[PDB]
């Protein structure tokens, strides 16, 4: 432990900002003595041998709240000469030696990404995201954060880069695959609302490659359909939904999930006279499904869950509502 | 060795630690944690655990909300009691005595023991308020928490009236009611201290039936033994 000699540099670096704040009338001298003592205690806690990511986050939160307090006080005392750049630089320094000391803590990596995104640092955010993905490649949350922020920026090629490396790594759970199909169809909806893409064959290709993965269950394909069924206002949405249903019917013929997609298929983009027409079609499918030879307890639990989802909406007729209740109660 | 006697009185009257081993021992003295863990604990960890304890105590009883502002404050994480003046130390002593009178009823509970552990590990109540702390733990003199408080108490910081506890500090066993009653019949100071503690609580209406039954039993047995001592047969001596 050379921690005193190690923290001497960070205190001597933070000193001239305190000299500027003392030569302005923004912080008084007793308050600056308090800032000196608090930063000194924080540095000698941070550079200690036995340290913790919560200790690094407490120091980050204190420095960021000091920047916010000085911003409020500077706007109140009407000064424009004092800048926040030194505080952002030292907060980046705290975070860089934080991710040096504890690279295996995703809470601290995500706090670093939240800070770098919040003070408008996109290129630095991309570099931090690359380092975090290299250290935690099995983390679907980090991969979806990278891909969704690249899609939110609009660099769809970079979003596909992050997502295809993520689906190359995370193949135990379906989560990142579902989020990639969600992002690709959101790109398809953006390409539609801007008015290949005319076919929209990429989620069908995602399904065809996902057919051979170690998570490939009927529940996983039902999760694929439950992702796909949102935002039906598209062009090839009926093509995608019909391909999912014929894949599940050709592969898992008598599963309750396949009977559930047989129930809930024809209600794609409905909200309105086309609503109860397709509801009567789907209820015919549902009655045939309930009488048919399938695990009725599993199919009934699926249908009462979907019927709670149905009952969550207003603006319907009471006869339809009470016949949903009557068909619910005997399950 | 008159110089060694004067220096022994100075070292016993001194209060703040002045070398690193003394600071580590005085920080190691705790109620809950073992000493090997309690050396290496900053005042944010202790404040988090003991503020969870005080949140439970303040949800139990309503009248702990001024101590939420003055004793268990996030600023009271940082205050060193040995750096404030005599009037600040006396007002802090009044606040501590009021909290101990308030917390004496719930002291079998682990929230209240966590709150007393915060007072002990921050404000050093076992050194600066040994009288009120020892008196508020005296009605619970049959419990392991009293055994631990007796373990962490300094020896020369106990008042003269409670110096019957020295064999029970040398061998860590809870003292019996026979020992407390016999020292109450022998010393008037211990009986006056117990009665002064419970009357100072009962004037502030922070009584509880354990304390009332404790004081009633010990003053009854102490007046019994005191009459059996005072009886003499000679007329002027019995007068």
């Amino acid at each position: 432990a050379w921690v005193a000699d190690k923290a001497r540099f960070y205190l001597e670096r933070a000193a001239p900002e305190l000299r500027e704040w003392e030569e302005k009338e923004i912080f008084t001298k007793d308050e600056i003595r308090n800032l000196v003592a608090k930063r000194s205690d924080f540095e000698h806690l941070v550079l200690a041998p036995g340290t913790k990511p919560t200790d690094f986050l407490n120091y980050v939160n204190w420095e960021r709240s000091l920047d916010r307090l000085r911003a409020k006080r500077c706007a109140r005392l009407n000064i424009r000469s004092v800048t926040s750049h030194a505080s952002q630089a030292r907060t980046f320094g705290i975070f860089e030696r934080a991710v040096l000391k504890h690279p295996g803590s995703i809470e601290l990596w995500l706090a670093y990404l939240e800070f770098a995104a919040q003070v408008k640092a996109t290129k630095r955010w991309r570099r931090i995201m690359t380092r975090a993905l290299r250290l935690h490649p099995m983390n679907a949350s980090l991969w979806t954060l990278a891909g969704r922020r690249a899609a939110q920026n609009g660099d769809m090629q970079r979003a596909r880069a992050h997502f295809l490396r993520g689906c190359r790594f995370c193949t135990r759970e379906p989560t990142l695959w579902l989020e990639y199909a969600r992002c690709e169809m959101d790109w398809l909806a953006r390409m539609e609302a801007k008015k290949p893409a005319l076919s929209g064959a990429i989620p069908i290709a995602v399904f065809d490659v996902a057919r051979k993965q170690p998570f490939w269950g009927p529940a996983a394909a039902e999760k694929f359909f439950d992702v796909f069924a949102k935002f039906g206002h598209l062009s090839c949405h009926e093509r995608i939904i019909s391909h999912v249903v014929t894949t599940m019917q050709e592969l898992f013929p008598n599963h309750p999930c396949t009977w559930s997609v047989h129930i809930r298929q024809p209600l794609v983009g409905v909200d309105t006279p086309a609503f109860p027409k397709a509801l009567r079609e789907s209820l015919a499918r549902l009655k045939a499904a309930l009488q048919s030879t399938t695990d009725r307890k599993a199919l009934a639990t699926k249908m009462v869950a979907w019927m709670d989802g149905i009952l969550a909406i207003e603006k319907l007729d009471a006869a339809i509502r009470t016949v949903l209740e009557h068909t619910k109660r005997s399950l | 060795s008159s110089l060694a006697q004067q220096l022994a009185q100075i070292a016993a009257n001194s209060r703040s630690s002045f070398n690193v081993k003394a600071l580590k021992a005085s920080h190691s003295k705790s109620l809950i944690w073992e000493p090997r863990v309690a050396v290496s604990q900053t005042f944010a960890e202790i404040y988090s655990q003991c503020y969870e304890g005080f949140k439970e105590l303040c949800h139990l009883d309503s009248r702990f909300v001024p101590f939420d502002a003055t004793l268990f404050s996030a600023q009271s994480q940082e205050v060193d009691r040995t750096q404030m003046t005599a009037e600040e130390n006396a007002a802090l002593d009044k606040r501590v005595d009021s909290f101990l009178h308030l917390v004496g009823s719930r002291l079998r509970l682990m929230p209240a023991i966590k709150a007393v552990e915060w007072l002990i590990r921050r404000f050093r109540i076992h050194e600066f308020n040994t009288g009120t702390l020892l008196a508020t733990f005296l009605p619970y003199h049959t419990i392991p928490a009293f055994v631990t408080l007796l373990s962490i108490l300094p020896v020369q910081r106990i008042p003269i009236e409670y110096r019957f506890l020295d064999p029970y500090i040398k061998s860590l066993t809870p003292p019996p009611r026979a020992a407390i009653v016999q020292q109450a019949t022998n010393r008037p100071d211990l009986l006056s201290a117990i009665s002064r503690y419970t009357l100072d609580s009962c004037r502030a209406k922070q009584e509880y039936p354990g304390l009332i039954s404790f004081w009633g039993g010990i003053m009854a047995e102490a007046v019994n033994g005191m009459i059996d001592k005072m009886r003499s047969g000679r007329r002027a001596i019995q007068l």
């Binding site: 001597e12 000196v36 | 060694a4 100075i10 009257n13 002045f18 070398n19 040995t82 750096q83």
Partner: protein, 479 residues
Amino acid sequence: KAELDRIRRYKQAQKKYGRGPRVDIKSVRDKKLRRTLTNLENKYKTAALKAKEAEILLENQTGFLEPEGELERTYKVRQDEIVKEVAVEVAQKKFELKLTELGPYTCEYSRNGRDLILAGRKGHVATMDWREGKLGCELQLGETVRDARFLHNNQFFAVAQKKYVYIYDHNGVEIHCLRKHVEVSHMEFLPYHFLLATLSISGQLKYQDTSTGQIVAEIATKHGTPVSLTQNPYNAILHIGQQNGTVTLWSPNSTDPLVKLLAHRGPVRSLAVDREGRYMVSTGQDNKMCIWDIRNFKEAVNSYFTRAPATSVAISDTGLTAVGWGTHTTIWKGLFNKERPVQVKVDSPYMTWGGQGQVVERVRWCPFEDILGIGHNEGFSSIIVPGAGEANYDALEVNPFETKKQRQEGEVKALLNKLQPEMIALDPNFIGNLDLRSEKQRQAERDLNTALKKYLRKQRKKNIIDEKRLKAEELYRQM
């Protein structure tokens, strides 16, 4: 303008941390020398500027007391009022040791203020850690005791007995006695050199190297027994103070005194000298005390008067001084300000300790706390005075809370950087300056009517004829 604060900052830092005027880069004729000296001037300027900017991270605050009303004055403040108004960890340090039967006592702190040694006249020498209240040693020694002094640590101390000095370990076990130092009446330990300098009653001053154990230079002060002795902490030269009334400045590299400041008509009774080496206050037998600028060797102000011949005087880490005369000491604040070019006299003392019949033998400042220890005939008495004491210490030089490992490492580093006793002069930063005679001889070996009568008057007495004198005779004949 807004840059006026910048120019004021640079003037202040060049005053304080600059340690010299500045290198004149315009007079440099060589080009590579000009750009390297411009580089060096930029580096030294940012060095002083960064030290001044990093003087904000100092933790503690200097203590003080200031009178509020117009009738209230600072010297009428009672110690009970100070103890009531001050914090408790520093109100603990105001104690009093009552040791009556073993002579007037003599206090000396260690140079971090951890342990103090107090020695009675009839033998009772004790070594205590006065804050923690434990005594490291106490021993009785029989015979008289002239002066007791800590060495580099609180491990070894040195006591001046009736004939010799003896140095002792931490437990009081006598390590050895020094037989060359006979009848030592005064001692002073140079801290950075490892020399122990002893004035005998005969007037002989011996410097003994404590680390290696050989006496470096026995100087014999040719005139009289010495009355007092102090030690400049900046030059490590010894201000001894004689009985004819001059103080003389001594150094182990000369048998004559370096300067002799003429002082009071009677003997000087006590001396004290600032830790920056700026000023020296001396108290004489004639009832005056007076201060001197040491860097210019002149008297700063008029002589103050003390109302008795002052037995001791010791000045603090800040500007305070305690002059202890008769049976009560008085503390003065503003005797010598560093910033003022011409000093002014102080009207009233800063604060006075009481005269209640205990004659003051020696006053000493605890080096880092705001207290003052007076050793008197009834024992030791520590009083608290708020303005004194350096508030911010440096943990590399000397540490008031030094652990065992830090004390061991610091003792080894001080042993490695002990200074040789030939590195002692009036200006301690001379190492690397020019030998002007040798430089003139080097440049010589590289490049290769009113006085000419006393010339012949001096050279007619030899009687060597010496052809330059023949030329001078022909010149005198022509004149």
